[PDB]
């Protein structure tokens, strides 16, 4: 392996922003990690950015504020950035660089994996088959998530997408009729939501499932770019070598791309469309496409990215490319958060493109296809009656448009409304979903075929 001793240069040729450029380097690698030690003693870390003959451009992680070109010693490693993975890191809280912050010890490695990762062979993938049960009714009843799906949650600043992400992590599991884990990556969080995540998951008793990667907002913007790659290499050890089912939640992927745009422009690159890098499509794809089931192993990786659309724009290139690689969306809505509904998940625009394979007999239950699209039709027909009632009044609505406004007062306050600690299992999000479909008679339910109307309506 790497048994030769390491060279420790003090031949710094210049500092220019976050870049330290050395010279007379003996065979420098690309993307190799170095360890700079300052004059006073502060050890900083950095990654080699460009080599050219006897040169090396080093991008220091923690900035260059105090580096001189006379007394700074820059010890090279000779190997690229790798993570130590273990199965006993399920239950720890690491930061963006992979150091523990829960007063824990350093993780004893079972492997040292390169965090950039190799792609999966497209022949060796299987189509996603079973259900991941979250516990939130609005994304399990009508927007069900397969095993291996990549389905982002679309929201905005101020909306409670961070408590939806914390409620998924507390209650995610299988669809019971020993191999489940959650890798929660938090990029660009502040402190008061970092101690929301660190405190909620550790005293709601399910810290043992989750491996928490908390990358703060005041931490360096290069450490936000290796945070989802530390979280997905841990998930690819835990799933494709230990046969667990892993759910990978990446919180605020629009804050990854604001740290990628910052790292790109500080690499002296020229920006592309809307200022974002031109390689932004194949940079998110190296993150998102680390998913799916595999052939010959019993694990899987299902991803839930989370986005923050600026000014509720959908043509912004962070939601544009996420909707270009990932399969569907969830659409946390603002007009439901003002009306005090938790979780404020809109149903009408939301979609899971693999929902028709995660449902059915022997996966969830036999009527999960016919219930969901029936509640989807009656939610749309009510919301037309909801606006129409204001135009003509109550005395002008018949006994048809009152069944849809009386259903609509109970679909938002019983199906959508959950409360943050109420784990509705998927067998209980259908019995909720049926006792709203009994407000209508069997002569009105058009989306349900008659064979399961005979088996599930009369109770």
């Amino acid at each position: 392996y790497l048994s030769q001793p390491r060279l420790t240069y003090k031949t710094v040729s210049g500092v220019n922003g976050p870049l330290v450029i050395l010279d007379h380097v003996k065979f420098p690698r690309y993307a190799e990690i170095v360890h700079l030690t300052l004059p006073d003693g502060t050890k900083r870390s950095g990654q080699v950015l460009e080599v050219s003959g006897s040169k090396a451009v080093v991008q220091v992680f923690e900035g260059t504020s105090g580096i001189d070109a006379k007394k700074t010693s820059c010890e090279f490693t000779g190997d690229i950035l790798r993570t130590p993975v273990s199965e006993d890191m399920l239950g720890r809280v690491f930061n963006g660089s992979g150091k523990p912050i829960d007063r824990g010890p350093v993780v004893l490695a079972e492997d040292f994996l390169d965090i950039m990762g190799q792609p999966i062979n497209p022949q060796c993938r299987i189509y996603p088959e079973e259900m991941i049960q979250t516990g939130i009714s609005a994304i399990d009843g009508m927007n069900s998530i397969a095993r291996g799906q990549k389905i982002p949650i679309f929201s905005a600043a101020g909306l409670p997408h961070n408590e939806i992400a914390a409620q998924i992590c507390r209650q995610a599991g299988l669809v019971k009729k020993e191999n489940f884990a959650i890798v929660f990556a938090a990029m660009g969080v502040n402190m008061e939501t970092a101690r929301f995540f660190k405190s909620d998951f550790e005293e709601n008793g399910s810290m043992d499932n989750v491996c928490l990667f908390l990358n703060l907002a005041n931490d360096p913007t290069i450490e936000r770019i290796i945070t989802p790659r530390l979280a997905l290499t841990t998930a690819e050890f835990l799933a494709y070598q230990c046969e667990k089912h892993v759910l990978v939640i990446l919180t605020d992927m629009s804050s990854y791309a604001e740290a990628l745009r910052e790292v790109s422009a500080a690499r002296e690159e020229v920006p592309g469309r809307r200022g974002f890098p031109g390689y932004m499509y194949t940079d998110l794809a190296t993150i998102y496409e680390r998913a799916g089931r595999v052939e010959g192993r019993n694990g899987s990786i299902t991803q839930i990215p989370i986005l923050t659309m600026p000014n509720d724009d959908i043509t912004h290139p962070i939601p544009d490319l996420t909707g270009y690689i990932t399969e569907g969306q969830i659409y946390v809505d603002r007009q439901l958060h003002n009306r005090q509904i938790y979780p404020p998940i809109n149903v009408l625009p939301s979609l899971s493109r693999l929902m028709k394979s995660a449902i059915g007999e022997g996966m969830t239950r036999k009527d999960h296809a016919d219930v969901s699209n029936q509640l989807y039709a009656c939610y749309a027909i009510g919301k037309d009656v909801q606006a129409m009632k204001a135009v003509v009044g109550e005395e002008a609505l018949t006994s048809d448009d009152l069944l849809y406004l009386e259903f609509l007062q109970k679909f938002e306050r019983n199906f959508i409304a959950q409360g943050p600690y109420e784990n509705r299992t998927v067998y209980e999000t259908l019995d909720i979903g049926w006792q709203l479909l009994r407000i209508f008679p069997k002569e009105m339910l058009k989306r349900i075929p008659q064979s399961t109307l005979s088996e599930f309506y009369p109770r």
Binding site: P122, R125, Y279, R290, A291
Partner: protein
């Protein structure tokens, strides 16, 4: 034999196309026909019922060779195609055969190199011109060619060339012109007087 993918394979004569590419469908053969040698286009989205055409053209056409190009696609939308093509059947002479005795596939997911997705349109058109010079009638399906133009926009910015129209480079309508013009019923270069064809079935995503 080894052929560079960006040079057109030589033919003797590029004849006009006078024979219908006959699918099993009643619409788009009684209403909107295609020929053996012609170039089509299809909107490929989620839930358009697109997989009628990609599997009818593979089983029921008068094509002898299918070359399916998947350029820059999704992860679990490429693995769907690789799952159901090695079980699709076809019956000539009564006895049944799998269609993987006459298809080749070019699978490029999103996770691939960006330069391998630019050269998946060109790899699948060069293989399709290798059986056209045998005298077969190749029908090629280039699924989601708008992902290929998302790959060319990166390669254009990889070399620092200036974006022209909506971020795409200057040569967007010209590499699409230098691809759909390799389709056509030709007379092959060679002695025992054959005559082959290539039909390109594109797929776009507005």
């Amino acid at each position: 034999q080894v052929w560079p993918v960006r040079q057109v394979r030589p033919v003797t004569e590029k004849l006009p196309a006078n024979h219908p590419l006959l699918t099993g469908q009643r619409v788009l053969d009684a209403l909107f026909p295609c020929v053996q040698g012609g170039t089509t286009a299809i909107p490929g989205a989620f839930g358009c019922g697109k997989t009628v055409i990609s599997q009818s053209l593979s089983k029921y056409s008068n094509s002898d060779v299918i070359i399916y190009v998947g350029c820059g696609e999704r992860g679990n939308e490429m693995s769907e195609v690789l799952r159901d093509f090695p079980e699709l059947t076809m019956e000539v002479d009564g006895k049944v055969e799998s269609i993987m005795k006459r298809t080749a596939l070019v699978a490029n997911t999103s996770n691939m190199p960006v330069a391998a997705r630019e050269a998946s349109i060109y790899t699948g058109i060069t293989l399709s011109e290798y059986f056209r010079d045998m005298g077969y009638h190749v029908s090629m399906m280039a699924d989601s060619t708008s992902r290929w133009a998302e790959a060319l926009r990166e390669i254009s910015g990889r070399l620092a060339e200036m974006p022209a129209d909506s971020g795409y480079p200057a040569y967007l309508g010209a590499r699409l012109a230098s691809f759909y013009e390799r389709a056509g019923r030709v007379k092959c270069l060679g002695n025992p007087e054959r005559e082959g064809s290539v039909s390109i079935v594109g797929a776009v995503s507005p």
